[PDB]
Amino acid sequence: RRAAAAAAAAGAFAGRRAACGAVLLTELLERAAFYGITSNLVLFLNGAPFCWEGAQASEALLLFMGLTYLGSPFGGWLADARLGRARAILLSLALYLLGMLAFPLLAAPATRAALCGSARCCSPATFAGLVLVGLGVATVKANITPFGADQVKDRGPEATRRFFNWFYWSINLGAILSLGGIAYIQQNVSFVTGYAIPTVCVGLAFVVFLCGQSVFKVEDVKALVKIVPVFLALIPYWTVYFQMQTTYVLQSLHLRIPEISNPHTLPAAWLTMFDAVLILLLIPLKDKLVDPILRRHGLLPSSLKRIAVGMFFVMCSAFAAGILESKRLNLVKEKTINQTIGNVVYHAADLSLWWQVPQYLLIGISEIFASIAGLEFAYSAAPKSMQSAIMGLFFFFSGVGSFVGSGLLALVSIKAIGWMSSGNINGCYLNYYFFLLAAIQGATLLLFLIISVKYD
Ligand SMILES: *[C@@H]1O[C@H](CO)[C@@H](O)[C@H](O)[C@H]1NC(C)=O
CATH class of the missing domain: 1.20.1250.20 (MFS general substrate transporter like domains)
Incomplete structure (x- = not known):
């Protein structure tokens, strides 16, 4: 039918x-x-x-x-x-x-x-x-x-x-x-x-x-003033997402990374590749296993519930990262090894880098849902005349979220809190930062659910 x-x-x-x-x-x-x-x-x-x-x-x-x-x-x-x-x-x-x-x-x-x-x-x-x-x-x-x-x-x-x-x-x-x-x-x-x-x-x-x-034109004015709050409520999502981009690589640098050969000193940028390496392997698969499966069942058709699911998986990834960081901080007190990445040596625990795989799945699934559906919502829920200008506001609010995330990182680094008081992070409580990010993502999930219900 x-x-x-x-x-x-x-x-x-x-x-x-x-x-x-x-x-x-x-x-x-x-x-x-x-x-x-x-x-x-x-x-x-x-x-x-x-x-x-x-x-x-x-x-x-x-x-x-x-x-x-x-x-x-x-x-x-x-x-x-x-x-x-x-x-x-x-x-x-x-x-x-x-x-x-x-x-x-x-x-x-x-x-x-x-x-x-x-x-x-x-x-x-x-x-x-x-x-x-x-x-x-x-x-x-x-x-x-x-x-x-x-x-x-x-x-x-x-x-x-x-x-x-x-x-x-x-x-x-x-x-x-x-x-x-x-x-x-x-x-x-x-x-x-x-x-x-x-x-x-x-x-x-x-x-x-x-x-x-x-x-x-009053209709498109209504559309503008009605889609502005949805973009405003997405600032904490980008706040958490960019901080996860940064601190995940920070944690990866301080984890046992295997060597490839016997040109030396593999680039640090390779670590970021990890996230995108998942995304490729997910996008075809997902497509098939989502285009039939989720369509004939009438499940999750709107572009905002998918953003909510992405936020849920972001919070789950933050919790997994916090657990792994607690394990790493417990392990580092026993022994530490030195590994060179680029031209700097990092002190890392004897815990394998691949144990970080469960993190990158959960955010990867998030980028399957929240990242694409955000663009779909920005495209569809926009006036015909102002297309590519609503995307401008989307990518501008993404930058605002990135900057407020940088400010948040600067906040937890003060002497009063001391979570990020110090390239070695063996003395920094990254687990508390990950848990704070998870709490922020949960509050954002609730607020975004309310905003999405009101918008629809
Ligand atoms: C780690 O680096 C420190 C500082 O150079 C050094 O004293 C220590 O011996 C190193 N440990 C290993 C296993 O290389």
């Missing part, structure tokens, strides 16, 4: 298989370039060409990340009022490539003198490149997601749900490619070759759109 009809719609893509693969490939390349920049920015800035202090490099990276969130609402407005989505994304990609071209030249010893030969050694060029890259990333992110779903929007609301699955899958594949290959070359072979590859990725991503150009 109706179910049969919806399953038939799931039979999507169909005619438009080109128009989509082009968007998927473009997003893959863009994410590869972004993760190539973000993974080893601090090591580049604190090295031989640049004598920046660690605090200066951290502030520079923080400003670069903050720009990519602040520019999203303005990038979306530019793509709706003055230009089209295609032209806006093309201009953003051109600016992104222009900012891209700066880093290889600085890395190259011959061309460094031309740019900044004669505190911060080369602040103007680096800041201009980072500003251009941030604006390009912010404009691409706020516009690629609604542009991609535009092709599959005719076949009902079931095709835009399947597209947002292979979009996230392509994002994570690009993350794996960038953090595995490019991040390896940037630290082992050379920075020139490690930064030339993402520039080539940006160049290829620009060609794909040029090749694929041939195949691509």
